[PDB]
Amino acid sequence: KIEEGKLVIWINGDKGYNGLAEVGKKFEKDTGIKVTVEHPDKLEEKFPQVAATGDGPDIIFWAHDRFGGYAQSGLLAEITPAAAFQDKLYPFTWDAVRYNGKLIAYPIAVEALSLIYNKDLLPNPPKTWEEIPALDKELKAKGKSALMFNLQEPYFTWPLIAADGGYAFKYENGKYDIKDVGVDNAGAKAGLTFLVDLIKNKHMNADTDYSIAEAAFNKGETAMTINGPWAWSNIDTSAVNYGVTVLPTFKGQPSKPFVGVLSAGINAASPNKELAKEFLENYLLTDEGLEAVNKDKPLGAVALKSYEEELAKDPRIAATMENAQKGEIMPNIPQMSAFWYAVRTAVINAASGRQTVDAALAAAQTNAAAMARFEDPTRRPYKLPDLCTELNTSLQDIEITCVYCKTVLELTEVFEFARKDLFVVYRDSIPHAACHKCIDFYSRIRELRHYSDSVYGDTLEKLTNTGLYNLLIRCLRCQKPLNPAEKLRHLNEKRRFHNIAGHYRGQCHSCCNAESSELTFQELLGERR
Amino acid sequence: KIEEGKLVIWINGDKGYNGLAEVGKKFEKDTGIKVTVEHPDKLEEKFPQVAATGDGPDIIFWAHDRFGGYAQSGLLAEITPAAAFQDKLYPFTWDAVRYNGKLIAYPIAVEALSLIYNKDLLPNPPKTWEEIPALDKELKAKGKSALMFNLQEPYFTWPLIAADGGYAFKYENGKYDIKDVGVDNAGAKAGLTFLVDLIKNKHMNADTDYSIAEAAFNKGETAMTINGPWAWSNIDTSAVNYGVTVLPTFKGQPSKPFVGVLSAGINAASPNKELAKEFLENYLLTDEGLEAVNKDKPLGAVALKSYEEELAKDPRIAATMENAQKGEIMPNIPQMSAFWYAVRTAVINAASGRQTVDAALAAAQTNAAAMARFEDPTRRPYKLPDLCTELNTSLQDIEITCVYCKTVLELTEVFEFARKDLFVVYRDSIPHAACHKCIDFYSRIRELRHYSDSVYGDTLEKLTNTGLYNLLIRCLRCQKPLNPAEKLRHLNEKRRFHNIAGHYRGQCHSCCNAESSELTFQELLGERR
Ligand SMILES: OC[C@H]1O[C@H](O[C@H]2[C@H](O)[C@@H](O)[C@@H](O)O[C@@H]2CO)[C@H](O)[C@@H](O)[C@@H]1O
Ligand SMILES: OC[C@H]1O[C@H](O[C@H]2[C@H](O)[C@@H](O)[C@@H](O)O[C@@H]2CO)[C@H](O)[C@@H](O)[C@@H]1O
Ligand SMILES: [Zn+2]
Ligand SMILES: [Zn+2]
Ligand SMILES: [Zn+2]
Ligand SMILES: [Zn+2]
């Protein structure tokens, strides 16, 4: 579990964690309480896994969209700010961190993506996405490129995909209606097609990610990038002279970034909830607390009501709020992680020429719908191929982690899992399988600690009131169901079946197949021959 | 061990093993004895490892140079042919398979490398190595190359390296003498420099191997290759019209291929020695037996005296004997594998620009000398860095196999072995270490099967009559020697030291750091939640 009398804080690696650690230092000086700030990789996925086991940070920082799912799973303490403290922050920021009426996190700041441009290379940045190809040809001639931004996270491609998004029209027998089809609509496919065509025509590279696009822009190699307020401080220290402006329009529509409220939640398992509350309310959410973080990496527009007319004094924050107004606040429904995973796949499959845009966004909608069913134990798939089938994915491409060690199963291990007729297990509505090493290890442990009895094959037929032929018998070492030949080997070679943990187990063909071995070990240690 | 009443035969994968299996089929028809022919990868190294354990083939085929080492290790039965049978084969072929007076294999055929050339691309093949660069420029212009041959095995580069080889001159104080310096002489460095310059000037690629050079030649892409008689049949079936001629001269000296006598030895552990003898003498070493193999892949010049004046009827065999006469019969001293390993490294390091030619061939000589010392238990190195030091090799580059599983240790594992202060162990004068997986596994097995007693640290000081500070104590899980801090942790946390297999063991810092775990396994098997 978590250490009493100490605060552990997780926050994403692109935020001002160094400034946050200075707030923690001030907290220790004033109170004696030690604060440790960390930024684990993929912390938005690691938090519900470790918090489910009563472990993890005392405080987790993330955009508000993930917190609905955490709250639904019981992972967050209810937040109890006094009325006067609540009145310090914009009402809509509290609304972002409300879950079925209850406050589950403290809002910190409002973030949206903007267009960042090198003023020396591009005094007049383009107002439309459609200008960008021509501008890229001109800049290549000068040994530059027009635009580089992180294509790996759908957060960064969302603004363009969403720009012409819309409801779809429905029709039957002379009668028209309007229908919400999620991301499977013509406008979204239009924007995703435009992004793909940028890659097809070599205006962008599908492999570009955060650090590459950042390096390119801050070294003056590309004229434009797309990024949030946190990225300004690295550009500040670079020699680049940059501006921050409205994202380009697409088909005359504004780009529609998803707006995040950076928020701090308190682990439901923390024994330090009152300390966490004191830190968040009375040290971080002060002028000096937010300034220390913002000086490290800019927060965006802070949630404090006092700074409202100070916001537009900074043009970069005015541009942030302009893009924010043109986009939409992210939902915080518990299934937002399913939405994001489905869209991330659609965009990569599209930008890799794997799917058509239309098929990728149509699968995106139905995969998110299916993943939403992971909450229903009566309808969720418990076989790996059924999972694959319901997610429109080849076994060759599925990503699934071991329930024990959380590593992504390699392709060999995914095949074996399906081949051995094992069952998907759900932890907090996330499906898991198991890797080769964990199955083997816990096969061996299961063997010793749960050794009931042993019988010959003909005895087993009596105990089960079934013939050996169809009876499911798993190998005790690798869990593979024995085939009839392997059962026949048991009978002919007179090997028994062993009752391990309430069922009788056998050995497969493969698993079926020391005075000197130990004595070599002593030579390896130089003890004697 | 080996199966009585059956013959198992190993022969290299470039030989006529399909024809040899037809001889085995005829043997089964006439005698009832089943013959199985196999061609394991690296069989010349696998044979002494498995034959040391009373296992392996009944019969092993290889060039005679490896058989001295096998015989010295007791791996071969003495061969007992009658006087009249011996008179059937050339006396010098029997001499190749004599070991300290005793016959240890049956000779089959005489092999030497030749120059193979595409007559349509090159009616007049060059007589000298020095012509080859100019000829390669001319052929590149036509979209061809001059020469491609296996650069990975020093057998194929030996002819050129040896061409101007010589003894060196010695001098002191007005007095001159001649000295044998092995491969560390000016002529050998000259030839190895010429080969390297062919790679530097893009006349050959250092990565070229057997199958690449073969594919290139048999598809008409390169005008010349270097290969033995076994390679003729694949060229026969290709459309290439080819000739077989004398290797080119270097500095006016003939190329000097090493001449091999393909030979068949009988495993000292075989229970089928009389069957093996009957097969070899009376089925294989007949006109029809050798024809069946030779039709598959040509043998070269067979050892049967009867075919002497039939040899020169085939120009390819006349060219083989001409190159053989210009080269030398390989020695069969037990250390030939050390000679070959040292030269193989020298050539790769040279052709990769890693060493200079002079340093590579000078290290070759001294590494082979050092490896020869592996036979002396009083002088061989028992620490991995001492091994590295004596072989002029970085720990970063050493290749060493696990004594248990024979895998080559990966770089992580080589570092760990040295870091854990473990000892090189010698099996048949070959040095081994151990891989991470084998150490771990046999640490765990050692723990259970050899659990003497347990004591606290201050008790251990009494048992050893030494202070804890310098006392070597290994971690029972990873074998690392505990440092003083780790010993201090034992004392402060009151963990005891465990006597495993006659010495007290501890735990290292790293290794120091279930109703639900087992219950998840039942969901994975679908048995119940
Ligand atoms: O791309 C999907 C990802 O987007 C959002 O994450 C943002 C985060 O809001 C920003 O603060 C910034 O750090 O970049 C992240 C994207 O790399 C969602 O908040 C998140 O749930 C979602 O996975
Ligand atoms: O390259 C070192 C290697 O050379 C010889 O092996 C030859 C063998 O003699 C031929 O019959 C043919 O199969 O090609 C082999 C080279 O790849 C030595 O016989 C062997 O000991 C040595 O390792
Ligand atoms: Zn695992
Ligand atoms: Zn098995
Ligand atoms: Zn091993
Ligand atoms: Zn250890």
Coordinates of C-alpha atoms and ligand atoms in Angstrom, one line a residue, chain A residues 402 404-406 434-435 438, ligand 3:
Chain A
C402 CA -0.7 -10.5 -19.5
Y404 CA -0.1 -11.0 -14.2
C405 CA 2.9 -9.1 -15.5
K406 CA 1.1 -6.6 -17.8
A434 CA -1.4 -14.3 -20.1
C435 CA 2.2 -14.5 -21.4
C438 CA 3.6 -16.4 -16.5
Ligands
ZN3 ZN 3.2 -12.4 -17.8

